[PDB]
Design a protein around this ligand. Structure first.
Ligand SMILES: *CC(=O)[C@H](CC(=O)O)NC(=O)[C@@H]1C=C2CCCC[C@@H]2n2c(=O)n(C[C@H](CCC(=O)O)NC(=O)Cc3ccccc3)c(=O)n21
Ligand SMILES: *CC(=O)[C@H](CC(=O)O)NC(=O)[C@@H]1C=C2CCCC[C@@H]2n2c(=O)n(C[C@H](CCC(=O)O)NC(=O)Cc3ccccc3)c(=O)n21
Lengths: 140, 102, 102, 140
């Protein structure tokens, strides 16, 4: 077995958290163009036969509860799991609308020992967010 | 070998079979066009469309890396944020190849 | 598109074309046998020997991931450090496929 | 071009830093078995046609000067670059015999704008070291 078994009845979930608008108290500016990304992703992963679930403008708390609830589903008939995070970020951190969440808190729900119906199956986290404030001027 | 292999009972690591597809290198800004979307998600979707029936997932993601790195550059009236580049970052703790057409 | 592509002068990111083959996941211990060497380097060398004339480098490294994850487990008289596991971590900012037989 | 050009006259350098013995002041224990790793690597990368250079028990300062000098060579006739680090470590850090060095200091020498004869070419860093003190008990 050099390849993951991908012929379970369902390819699996594709959860898209699309954070466009942020509370005044954070000073984070609106993420114009993120809806274009969310729609592209929905269509792309639909054609790959994923069950796509889009969520907009979630608080840090809603992100955490959503991923907890999703990890507690029975994924036995699914080949894989995909989560796409679209927001502001810094290294190791994704922003809810009302502030930062540690990515580790999100991903830990899906660990091999904590989501048994996804043990042995590919868990993909696709992250569009900054990872700090360094600037690449490039070369050539 | 000896003490550390040919285990009677098999276990796997709790972080095994995760893949992180990051839009940008560690420590760096990531860039987004207000009308067309982010560079990374645009490129990811376009490469999945073109290659999901043909290539293994890491190879698809390596083309996303090249597309973002080579085709895109920031534009701003603020010189600080102008002409900036981005390289996405694939972090794989997968244990097998992933083919969507499987 | 428009302002951020079809650049007259081409540049690439300064972090492009790096690959990091880490022995273990972020935040974790990595393990070594006093007689046979580290799990990771043993497995890396064995997979390069077997597949360097046959597979692309990321696919070779995905087999290293599986070999380390599935075949190896720590042994210690100290319960704290006994029966522990490891998943290596591939961090690719490469822009193309790498074949050693090329 | 989906594949890196690998038919330059030389495959390139494979630099192996093999740190076995550490100064008393660090409290780091000897890394028994690392010589077996260093020898395996030398033979494996020799068969891939790399120019292998092994270095033993380097101070943090010697690591930094070695990688600086290597980055300042003319790599024009080489397809690639490989560095293998065998030592104690923590996240983002590799230990010289006399203390920690930031991995970023090592890798920055080879950036696209700082090592022009390796621009466009694969730069591989292979790291056997801890990345913290978490313990994986596994599952199954
Ligand atoms: C740091 C982050 O978490 C976000 C991630 C994301 O929103 O997807 N990154 C940014 O916000 C990135 C970085 C900066 C630096 C600090 C100021 C905020 C800034 N910024 C920003 O303003 N945009 C959106 C604009 C859109 C303008 C447009 O479409 O005309 N983009 C730019 O400023 C530069 C640019 C990039 C691509 C194409 C054109 C212009 C960001 O994406 N960021
Ligand atoms: C943390 C690090 O940077 C090093 C990386 C490296 O040396 O390659 N990792 C360790 O030192 C790893 C972790 C620990 C936890 C803290 C105490 C030190 C300990 N340790 C250690 O003692 N070894 C070597 C021994 C060898 C004993 C033997 O061969 O009988 N290995 C073990 O303790 C567990 C073990 C692992 C594999 C096979 C058998 C036993 C380490 O590698 N580490």
């Amino acid at each position: 077995d050099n390849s993951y078994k991908m012929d379970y009845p369902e390819m699996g979930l594709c959860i898209i958290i699309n954070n466009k608008n942020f509370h005044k108290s954070t000073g984070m500016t609106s993420r114009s163009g993120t809806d274009v990304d969310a729609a592209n992703l929905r269509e792309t992963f639909r054609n790959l036969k994923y069950e796509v679930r889009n969520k907009n403008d979630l608080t840090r708390e809603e992100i955490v509860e959503l991923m907890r609830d999703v990890s507690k589903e029975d994924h036995s008939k699914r080949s894989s799991f995909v989560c796409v995070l679209l927001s502001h970020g810094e290294e190791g951190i994704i922003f809810g609308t009302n502030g930062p969440v540690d990515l580790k808190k999100i991903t830990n729900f899906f660990r091999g020992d904590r989501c048994r119906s996804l043990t042995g199956k590919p868990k993909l986290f696709i992250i569009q967010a900054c990872r700090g404030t360094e600037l690449d001027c490039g070369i050539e | 070998s000896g003490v550390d292999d040919d285990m009677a009972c098999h276990k796997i690591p709790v972080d095994a079979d995760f893949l992180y597809a990051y839009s940008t290198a560690p420590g760096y800004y990531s860039w987004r066009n207000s009308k067309d979307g982010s560079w990374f998600i645009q490129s990811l979707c376009a490469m999945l469309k073109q290659y999901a029936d043909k290539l293994e997932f890491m190879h698809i993601l390596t083309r996303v890396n090249r597309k973002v790195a080579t085709e895109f550059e920031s534009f701003s009236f603020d010189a600080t944020f102008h002409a900036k580049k981005q390289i996405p970052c694939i972090v794989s703790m997968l244990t097998k190849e992933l083919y969507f057409y499987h």
